[PDB]
DNA sequence: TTTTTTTTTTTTTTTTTT
C-alpha cells in the first residue's frame, strides 16, 4: 500500500494530462506521517507497529544495485519513508528509543557486506537531532564500540562520523571510545589497526580536550607518538596518516611542530641531502620484496603533498621560527634536481619496459607513478611560491614536461595490451582549490604584471589541456563518490565554492572564445579546449543538480528566482547552438551539438 | 653548581625550583642533539655519564623537583614533552635513567595523591611509553617483572595494562609466559592480564590454553569481574570452537555462587550475554544446541530457562525452535514447575 | 588501435498454481 502510492504519485507528477483530470489525493505517505503525529497522546499500541513498518520498508527497499526510474524511485521513496517513520517515531515516543537505536546499530554492525548507507543516514539523523535525548539511551552506542575492530574500514569511518555529535557533548562516551581504539591499536588483524588510526585521527581532528589542561596536551602528544609509530607499518596506514595530518594541523594548531618534524624525519629516510646527485629521492627503499611478492611502502607523492600543503598553511596562517626554511630549501633542492634529472636516474624506459610479467617491471611502474606524483606536487608548489615569477613558471613547464614524458611512456605500454588498469587515470595530487586558481589565472587573468610570466604557460597548449583534464577529473570524482580526493575535498561547502569558480571560468572560456579558432591539427578536433570546457560545464550542472539541490539559486547568482537566471543561461547556450547550426559546416562537429543539447536538457529541468 | 644542572643550562632548559613547569629556549630535537654533542666532545668520556646521572638522582631526591622533572616542559616561543622523555631520547643516557627511574619507584608505593592529585608511579611508568629506541629491552623487561611482582595491587593493575605501549615488538614470549604464571596464582588480576594478552603478539595456541585456564577457574572470580571475563570469552570465539566453549560456559556458569550486591552484577552479566547474542547470531544456535543436547543430566539449572527466555525475547527466527526444545524438556520431565 | 553501443545471456525477483 506504500509502494503503490509512490508509483501513482510518480505517474501523475510526470504528466500534466493526468494533473488536469485527477484532483489532488492525499497519499499513504502523508497518512502514515499523520498517524505518527496522532500517536503522541496514548496510542502506545500503535507505535510498536510503526517501528516494525519502518524497518520493513527500509530492510526491503534499501539499495543494492550500487554496492533507471521504476526499480529506483518508488523504492528510494519507500526506504526514505521508512527512515522518516523511525525518525519521527524516535523523537516523541520516549520508550522506543533503544528499540530503534539498538536495531539501527545491530544492522550497521552485523551486515557490513550488503549496503547499509541508509541506516548510517538514519543513525546520523537520530544522533544529530538530539544527543541531548540520546544520553538517556547511550549504552546501546558504547556496546557497538566493542565491535569496531571487525568492521570494514569505510563502515568504521562512516559510523564514527555519524556518531560524532554524541562524542561532542558526552565525555564518558569519548573516554569509552579511547579505550577501544587504544586496545585495537595493537590487534593482530590488519583492519583493527586501520580503524584505530581512523578513530584517533578523527578524535584529534574534531577535538581539543581528550582536571588540569596540561594532561590533555600530553595525551595529544602520546596519541601523536602512537601514530608516529604506525608510520612504520604498511602503505595504506601510512596513506591514511598523510591525508589526516593536514586536518590535524588545521584544527589543533598547537600540534604544528609535532606533526611537521614527524613528516620531516620521515622525509629524510628517502631524501639524499647532497647536491649534484641526480636521482634526488631513493626510490628503492619505497618497494619491499619477500619471495616474489612485491609491494609499496611509503608513497613519496602523498608524503610530499602532505608536507607541501602543511607548509603552505604554515606560511599563510601561522606566521601572520628557523624550521620551515629548512623544509623550503629541501623542497627547492628537490625541484632543482628533478628538473635536470632524466629517466635513467630512476632507470626508466631504457633498462625496464615496465612489464606486468616480472617483478622488475612492477618496481619500475611503481617508480614511474611515484615520479609522476612528485612532479605534480612540485608543480603546485612552484605555482604557490611567488607572485607569478618567470623562472618558477619555467620550472613548472620543465616538471610538466617530465610528467608528460612519463605519461607518454605509460600510455604506449597500455598500447600493446589493453587499458584494463585504472592506475594512470588514478587521482592527481592537485587540490581542487589549486585547479580552480590555475584555470582562473590561465584563461581570465589579463593583469599586465602577470602576462609576461603566464605567456610561457599559455603557449603550452598541452599544459592547458592537462589542467582542464584535472578539473574534469575532480568533477567526475564529485559525481561518482560523494566528494573529491584532495585536501578540503570532504567539506561540501568547499566543493561548492570550487564548483562555482570552475563554472565561471569554463563559461568564460566557452562563450567568449568560440570553437572556430582551431589552428593546431585535425587530431585535436574531438580534443579541443573549447570542447572540454563545455564537457566540464555539463558535469558541473549535473553534479550541482544532484548534490547541491538546495543551493541552485546561490549557484546561479555566482554566474529574482531561478527561472530568470536559468533563462539567461539557456539564452547563452541556445544562442551557441544556433550559431553552431546556422554556420552550415559540412564537417559538422556533432559532439559539441550533443553536449549542448545535454546541457540544455540539464538546464531546462529548473524552469 | 652540579655538573647536571650546568650541562642542562648550557643545553637550553631552565630548571624550575619546583612549582611551575621547566622552560625551553630551543626546540626538542635541537636540545637533544645539543646535549648529545656536548657529552660527546667533552673529555673524560666514560665517567661524565655516571657523574651526570649521580647529579640527576641527587637533584630528584626532592619531591617537587622530581615531580616537575616527570611533568612536561614549557615552550617560550605552544606546549611540548618532559625532560625525562627528552633525556631518555638519547641512547647513551637511556639505561642509567632506566635504572634510577626503577630504583626510586618502591619509594612511592604507599604515597598516593597528597597535594596536586598527581599519582607519582603512574607518572614514572608514563615516561617509558612509546620509546623511539630501546637499548636495554631484556633488562627493562626483567626490571618491570620484578616491579610487577613486588607492586601494590592497584599499581600492578596499572602498570600491567601499559605493557604493550612500553615493550617493543620482540620480547612478547617470556612476558606472555610470566603473565600466565602470575595468572595461575593471582585471581584478583584475571581481568587486565587477558586484556593485555590479546594486545601483545602471542601465538594463538597460547591464547586458547589461557582461555581454557580461565574457564577452568570460572567459579573462583569475584562478582565485579565476572561480566568482563564472560565478555572476553564470548568476544574470543571463532566459528569452529564456538560450540565447545559455549557448552563449557553453559556447564560452568551457575548463579548459585553470586546471588544491590549480586542482583546488579547479574543484571550486568545478562546484559553482556544479551548484547553478545544480538550482535552475533551463532552464539544463540550454539547455546540452544548446548541446552538441547543436555538430555541425560536432569541437573538442569535456572540458567537453562533464563537463557531459553532471553534467546526467545531477542533474535526471533529461533522462536519455533525454542518452542520445540522447551516442549521436549517438559514431557521428558527435565524442566519442571519448581 | 581503442571506445562505445547493441545484443544476448544470466540472475534475481515476483506471481501464480499445486
UniProtKB/Swiss-Prot annotation, chain B:
<protein>
    <recommendedName>
        <fullName>Fanconi anemia group D2 protein</fullName>
    </recommendedName>
</protein>
<feature type="region of interest" description="Interaction with BRCA2">
    <location>
        <begin position="196"/>
        <end position="282"/>
    </location>
</feature>
<comment type="subunit">
    <text>Homodimer; cannot be ubiquitinated and does not bind DNA. Part of a FANCI-FANCD2 heterodimeric complex that binds and scans dsDNA for DNA damage. Interacts directly with FANCE and FANCI. Interacts with USP1 and MEN1. The ubiquitinated form specifically interacts with BRCA1 and BLM. Both the nonubiquitinated and the monoubiquitinated forms interact with BRCA2; this interaction is mediated by phosphorylated FANCG and the complex also includes XCCR3. The ubiquitinated form specifically interacts with MTMR15/FAN1 (via UBZ-type zinc finger), leading to recruit MTMR15/FAN1 to sites of DNA damage.</text>
</comment>
<comment type="similarity">
    <text>Belongs to the Fanconi anemia protein FANCD2 family.</text>
</comment>
<feature type="region of interest" description="Interaction with FANCE">
    <location>
        <begin position="1"/>
        <end position="239"/>
    </location>
</feature>
<comment type="function">
    <text>Required for maintenance of chromosomal stability. Promotes accurate and efficient pairing of homologs during meiosis. Involved in the repair of DNA double-strand breaks, both by homologous recombination and single-strand annealing. The FANCI-FANCD2 complex binds and scans double-stranded DNA (dsDNA) for DNA damage; this complex stalls at DNA junctions between double-stranded DNA and single-stranded DNA. May participate in S phase and G2 phase checkpoint activation upon DNA damage.</text>
</comment>
<feature type="modified residue" description="Phosphoserine; by ATM">
    <location>
        <position position="170"/>
    </location>
</feature>
